[PDB]
Design a protein around this ligand. Sequence first.
Ligand SMILES: CS(=O)(=O)N1CCc2c(c(-c3ccc(Cl)c(C#Cc4ccc(Cl)c(CNCc5ccccc5)c4)c3)nn2CCCN2CCOCC2)C1
Length: 220
Amino acid sequence: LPDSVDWREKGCVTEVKYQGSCGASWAFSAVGALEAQLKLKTGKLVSLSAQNLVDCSTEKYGNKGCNGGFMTTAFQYIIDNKGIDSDASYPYKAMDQKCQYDSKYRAATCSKYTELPYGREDVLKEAVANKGPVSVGVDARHPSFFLYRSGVYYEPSCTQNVNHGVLVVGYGDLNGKEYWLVKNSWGHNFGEEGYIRMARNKGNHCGIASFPSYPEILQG
Ligand SMILES: CS(=O)(=O)N1CCc2c(c(-c3ccc(Cl)c(C#Cc4ccc(Cl)c(CNCc5ccccc5)c4)c3)nn2CCCN2CCOCC2)C1
Protein backbone atom coordinates (compact mmCIF):
# COMPACT_ATOMS: atom_id res chain seq x y z
CA LEU A 1 0.00 0.00 0.00
CA PRO A 2 1.38 3.47 -0.89
CA ASP A 3 1.36 6.00 1.98
CA SER A 4 -0.50 8.47 -0.25
CA VAL A 5 -2.80 8.01 -3.23
CA ASP A 6 -4.33 10.60 -5.55
CA TRP A 7 -6.08 9.20 -8.63
CA ARG A 8 -6.11 12.67 -10.33
CA GLU A 9 -2.32 12.21 -10.82
CA LYS A 10 -3.15 9.22 -13.07
CA GLY A 11 -5.77 11.09 -15.12
CA CYS A 12 -8.56 8.86 -13.71
CA VAL A 13 -10.77 11.71 -12.38
CA THR A 14 -12.96 14.07 -14.47
CA GLU A 15 -13.73 17.70 -13.72
CA VAL A 16 -15.72 18.47 -10.58
CA LYS A 17 -19.45 18.70 -11.35
CA TYR A 18 -22.12 21.01 -9.92
CA GLN A 19 -25.29 19.16 -8.88
CA GLY A 20 -27.16 22.42 -8.29
CA SER A 21 -30.60 22.13 -6.74
CA CYS A 22 -31.09 18.41 -7.45
CA GLY A 23 -30.34 15.80 -4.77
CA ALA A 24 -28.62 13.46 -7.20
CA SER A 25 -25.30 13.09 -5.32
CA TRP A 26 -25.74 9.33 -5.57
CA ALA A 27 -25.53 9.60 -9.38
CA PHE A 28 -22.44 11.77 -9.45
CA SER A 29 -20.76 9.41 -6.98
CA ALA A 30 -21.56 6.38 -9.16
CA VAL A 31 -20.49 7.88 -12.50
CA GLY A 32 -17.29 9.20 -10.83
CA ALA A 33 -16.32 5.68 -9.80
CA LEU A 34 -17.03 4.14 -13.21
CA GLU A 35 -15.19 6.98 -15.04
CA ALA A 36 -12.00 5.91 -13.25
CA GLN A 37 -12.51 2.28 -14.29
CA LEU A 38 -13.16 3.23 -17.90
CA LYS A 39 -9.89 5.17 -17.96
CA LEU A 40 -8.01 2.32 -16.24
CA LYS A 41 -9.34 -0.22 -18.76
CA THR A 42 -9.19 1.78 -22.01
CA GLY A 43 -6.98 4.83 -21.41
CA LYS A 44 -9.86 7.21 -22.26
CA LEU A 45 -11.30 9.62 -19.67
CA VAL A 46 -14.84 10.71 -20.38
CA SER A 47 -17.53 12.18 -18.15
CA LEU A 48 -20.46 9.77 -17.89
CA SER A 49 -24.07 10.85 -17.66
CA ALA A 50 -25.37 11.39 -14.10
CA GLN A 51 -28.63 12.42 -15.87
CA ASN A 52 -28.94 8.96 -17.49
CA LEU A 53 -28.98 7.60 -13.94
CA VAL A 54 -31.46 10.23 -12.61
CA ASP A 55 -33.90 9.54 -15.46
CA CYS A 56 -33.50 5.75 -15.91
CA SER A 57 -32.32 4.16 -12.67
CA THR A 58 -35.58 4.61 -10.80
CA GLU A 59 -38.08 2.42 -8.89
CA LYS A 60 -36.50 -0.91 -9.87
CA TYR A 61 -33.25 0.31 -8.16
CA GLY A 62 -34.92 2.06 -5.23
CA ASN A 63 -33.78 5.44 -6.58
CA LYS A 64 -35.76 8.68 -6.77
CA GLY A 65 -33.70 10.97 -9.03
CA CYS A 66 -33.38 14.43 -7.51
CA ASN A 67 -34.84 13.03 -4.23
CA GLY A 68 -31.94 10.61 -3.66
CA GLY A 69 -30.73 7.10 -4.29
CA PHE A 70 -27.86 4.65 -3.99
CA MET A 71 -24.59 4.09 -5.84
CA THR A 72 -24.86 0.27 -5.57
CA THR A 73 -28.19 0.06 -7.37
CA ALA A 74 -27.03 2.72 -9.85
CA PHE A 75 -24.24 0.28 -10.80
CA GLN A 76 -26.86 -2.52 -11.11
CA TYR A 77 -28.80 -0.35 -13.52
CA ILE A 78 -25.65 0.09 -15.66
CA ILE A 79 -25.18 -3.70 -15.52
CA ASP A 80 -28.81 -4.50 -16.43
CA ASN A 81 -28.92 -1.81 -19.14
CA LYS A 82 -25.65 -2.94 -20.79
CA GLY A 83 -24.44 0.64 -20.71
CA ILE A 84 -24.52 4.27 -19.71
CA ASP A 85 -24.26 7.34 -21.96
CA SER A 86 -21.53 9.96 -21.97
CA ASP A 87 -22.35 13.19 -20.14
CA ALA A 88 -21.77 15.11 -23.42
CA SER A 89 -24.52 13.07 -25.18
CA TYR A 90 -26.94 12.99 -22.21
CA PRO A 91 -26.25 16.23 -20.31
CA TYR A 92 -27.15 17.13 -16.78
CA LYS A 93 -30.23 19.30 -16.16
CA ALA A 94 -30.62 19.06 -12.36
CA MET A 95 -34.20 17.80 -12.62
CA ASP A 96 -36.08 14.54 -13.15
CA GLN A 97 -36.65 13.72 -16.79
CA LYS A 98 -38.06 10.96 -18.93
CA CYS A 99 -35.49 8.17 -19.53
CA GLN A 100 -33.67 9.02 -22.78
CA TYR A 101 -30.92 6.37 -22.73
CA ASP A 102 -29.56 5.94 -26.24
CA SER A 103 -27.25 2.95 -26.91
CA LYS A 104 -25.75 4.92 -29.85
CA TYR A 105 -23.84 7.11 -27.34
CA ARG A 106 -23.02 4.44 -24.70
CA ALA A 107 -19.55 5.34 -23.29
CA ALA A 108 -19.17 2.65 -20.62
CA THR A 109 -20.51 -0.61 -19.29
CA CYS A 110 -20.22 -2.23 -15.85
CA SER A 111 -19.63 -5.96 -15.24
CA LYS A 112 -20.07 -6.07 -11.46
CA TYR A 113 -19.78 -4.06 -8.28
CA THR A 114 -18.35 -4.81 -4.86
CA GLU A 115 -19.62 -3.52 -1.52
CA LEU A 116 -16.97 -3.13 1.20
CA PRO A 117 -17.40 -4.07 4.90
CA TYR A 118 -18.99 -1.41 7.18
CA GLY A 119 -16.56 0.87 8.99
CA ARG A 120 -13.42 -0.92 7.77
CA GLU A 121 -11.09 1.96 6.95
CA ASP A 122 -8.17 -0.45 6.32
CA VAL A 123 -10.20 -2.30 3.71
CA LEU A 124 -11.24 1.04 2.14
CA LYS A 125 -7.60 2.10 1.97
CA GLU A 126 -6.70 -1.18 0.21
CA ALA A 127 -9.48 -0.80 -2.39
CA VAL A 128 -8.57 2.85 -3.07
CA ALA A 129 -4.92 1.80 -3.63
CA ASN A 130 -5.44 -1.39 -5.61
CA LYS A 131 -8.86 -0.89 -7.34
CA GLY A 132 -9.49 2.83 -7.87
CA PRO A 133 -11.83 5.52 -6.61
CA VAL A 134 -14.57 4.20 -4.31
CA SER A 135 -18.15 5.47 -4.02
CA VAL A 136 -19.08 6.30 -0.44
CA GLY A 137 -21.70 8.05 1.67
CA VAL A 138 -20.79 10.62 4.29
CA ASP A 139 -22.59 12.51 7.04
CA ALA A 140 -22.34 15.94 5.35
CA ARG A 141 -25.31 17.60 7.17
CA HIS A 142 -23.23 19.66 9.62
CA PRO A 143 -22.58 23.39 9.03
CA SER A 144 -18.81 22.79 9.18
CA PHE A 145 -19.07 20.60 6.07
CA PHE A 146 -20.82 23.40 4.15
CA LEU A 147 -18.14 25.97 5.20
CA TYR A 148 -15.15 23.64 4.61
CA ARG A 149 -12.28 25.49 2.88
CA SER A 150 -9.02 23.61 3.60
CA GLY A 151 -7.07 21.34 5.93
CA VAL A 152 -8.45 18.02 7.19
CA TYR A 153 -12.13 17.99 8.01
CA TYR A 154 -13.12 16.79 11.51
CA GLU A 155 -16.53 17.39 13.03
CA PRO A 156 -17.16 16.09 16.58
CA SER A 157 -20.95 15.99 15.81
CA CYS A 158 -20.53 13.68 12.79
CA THR A 159 -22.27 10.30 12.93
CA GLN A 160 -21.71 7.10 10.97
CA ASN A 161 -25.11 7.56 9.28
CA VAL A 162 -24.64 8.81 5.75
CA ASN A 163 -26.71 11.37 3.85
CA HIS A 164 -24.70 12.52 0.85
CA GLY A 165 -22.88 10.54 -1.81
CA VAL A 166 -19.26 11.38 -2.68
CA LEU A 167 -16.19 9.72 -4.24
CA VAL A 168 -12.94 8.75 -2.47
CA VAL A 169 -10.22 9.47 -5.01
CA GLY A 170 -7.30 8.95 -2.66
CA TYR A 171 -5.76 9.30 0.78
CA GLY A 172 -2.76 10.82 2.61
CA ASP A 173 -1.46 12.42 5.83
CA LEU A 174 -1.42 16.25 5.83
CA ASN A 175 1.50 17.03 8.19
CA GLY A 176 0.29 14.55 10.93
CA LYS A 177 -3.43 14.51 10.01
CA GLU A 178 -4.49 11.36 8.09
CA TYR A 179 -7.21 12.03 5.49
CA TRP A 180 -9.32 10.64 2.67
CA LEU A 181 -9.28 12.72 -0.53
CA VAL A 182 -12.98 13.20 -1.47
CA LYS A 183 -14.46 14.56 -4.69
CA ASN A 184 -17.77 16.33 -4.06
CA SER A 185 -20.32 17.42 -6.69
CA TRP A 186 -20.78 21.04 -5.52
CA GLY A 187 -18.56 22.60 -8.21
CA HIS A 188 -15.05 23.98 -7.89
CA ASN A 189 -15.93 26.69 -5.28
CA PHE A 190 -16.64 24.08 -2.61
CA GLY A 191 -13.52 23.19 -0.54
CA GLU A 192 -10.22 22.87 -2.39
CA GLU A 193 -11.30 23.18 -6.04
CA GLY A 194 -14.30 20.94 -5.31
CA TYR A 195 -12.50 18.47 -3.05
CA ILE A 196 -12.50 17.83 0.69
CA ARG A 197 -9.93 16.03 2.81
CA MET A 198 -11.85 14.11 5.48
CA ALA A 199 -10.42 12.61 8.67
CA ARG A 200 -9.06 9.07 8.16
CA ASN A 201 -8.65 6.35 10.85
CA LYS A 202 -10.71 8.28 13.38
CA GLY A 203 -13.39 5.65 13.99
CA ASN A 204 -15.18 5.82 10.65
CA HIS A 205 -15.54 9.57 10.86
CA CYS A 206 -18.73 10.88 9.22
CA GLY A 207 -19.48 7.27 8.15
CA ILE A 208 -17.04 7.53 5.25
CA ALA A 209 -16.40 3.76 5.41
CA SER A 210 -20.04 2.87 6.29
CA PHE A 211 -21.25 1.94 2.76
CA PRO A 212 -18.42 1.95 0.25
CA SER A 213 -18.77 0.38 -3.19
CA TYR A 214 -16.88 0.34 -6.53
CA PRO A 215 -17.74 -0.90 -10.03
CA GLU A 216 -15.60 -3.03 -12.31
CA ILE A 217 -15.23 -3.45 -16.09
CA LEU A 218 -13.97 -7.00 -16.66
CA GLN A 219 -11.71 -8.05 -19.52
CA GLY A 220 -12.81 -11.60 -20.10
C1 LIG B 1 -29.29 5.24 7.65
S1 LIG B 1 -27.77 4.44 7.30
O1 LIG B 1 -27.52 3.48 8.33
O2 LIG B 1 -26.76 5.43 7.04
N1 LIG B 1 -27.97 3.61 5.90
C2 LIG B 1 -28.83 2.42 5.95
C3 LIG B 1 -28.35 1.35 4.92
C4 LIG B 1 -27.74 1.99 3.71
C5 LIG B 1 -27.59 3.32 3.55
C6 LIG B 1 -26.97 3.47 2.28
C7 LIG B 1 -26.57 4.70 1.57
C8 LIG B 1 -25.49 4.76 0.69
C9 LIG B 1 -25.17 5.97 0.05
C10 LIG B 1 -25.94 7.10 0.30
CL1 LIG B 1 -25.54 8.60 -0.50
C11 LIG B 1 -27.02 7.04 1.17
C12 LIG B 1 -27.85 8.16 1.47
C13 LIG B 1 -28.57 9.05 1.78
C14 LIG B 1 -29.43 10.10 2.24
C15 LIG B 1 -30.14 9.97 3.44
C16 LIG B 1 -30.97 10.98 3.86
C17 LIG B 1 -31.09 12.13 3.09
CL2 LIG B 1 -32.14 13.38 3.66
C18 LIG B 1 -30.39 12.29 1.88
C19 LIG B 1 -30.52 13.55 1.04
N2 LIG B 1 -29.29 14.39 1.13
C20 LIG B 1 -29.40 15.45 2.17
C21 LIG B 1 -28.09 16.19 2.36
C22 LIG B 1 -27.60 17.03 1.37
C23 LIG B 1 -26.40 17.70 1.55
C24 LIG B 1 -25.67 17.53 2.71
C25 LIG B 1 -26.15 16.70 3.70
C26 LIG B 1 -27.36 16.03 3.53
C27 LIG B 1 -29.56 11.25 1.48
C28 LIG B 1 -27.32 5.85 1.80
N3 LIG B 1 -26.77 2.29 1.70
N4 LIG B 1 -27.25 1.39 2.61
C29 LIG B 1 -27.17 -0.03 2.28
C30 LIG B 1 -28.50 -0.54 1.74
C31 LIG B 1 -28.88 0.10 0.46
N5 LIG B 1 -30.20 -0.40 -0.10
C32 LIG B 1 -30.33 0.00 -1.53
C33 LIG B 1 -31.62 -0.45 -2.08
O3 LIG B 1 -32.69 0.19 -1.43
C34 LIG B 1 -32.70 -0.22 -0.02
C35 LIG B 1 -31.38 0.13 0.69
C36 LIG B 1 -28.03 4.30 4.59
